[PDB]
Amino acid sequence: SMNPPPPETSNPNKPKRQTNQLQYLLRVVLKTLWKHQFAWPFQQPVDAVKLNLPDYYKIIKTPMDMGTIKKRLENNYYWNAQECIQDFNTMFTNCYIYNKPGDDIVLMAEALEKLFLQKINELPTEE
Ligand X SMILES: Cc1noc(C)c1-c1ccc2c(c1)[C@H](c1ccccc1)N(C)C2=O
Residue whose CB is less far from ligand X, 28 or 105: 105
When binding is defined by CB under 6 A, the residue of 105, 115, 120, 123 that contacts ligand X is 105
Ranges within 22-51 binding ligand X (CB under 6 A): 41-42, 46, 51
Q: Residue 53: CB partners within 8 Å, gap ≥ 6?
A: 46
Q: Under the criterion CB under 6 A, does residue 104 sit at the interface with ligand X?
A: yes
DSSP secondary structure, 11-63, as one string = -TTS-----HHHHHIIIIIIHHHHTSTT-GGGSS---TTTTT-TTHHHH-SS-
Q: Under the criterion CB under 6 A, does residue 116 sit at the interface with ligand X?
A: no
Query: Which residues of this protein are in contact with ligand X, per CB under 6 A?
Result: 41-42, 46, 51, 53, 95, 98-99, 104-105
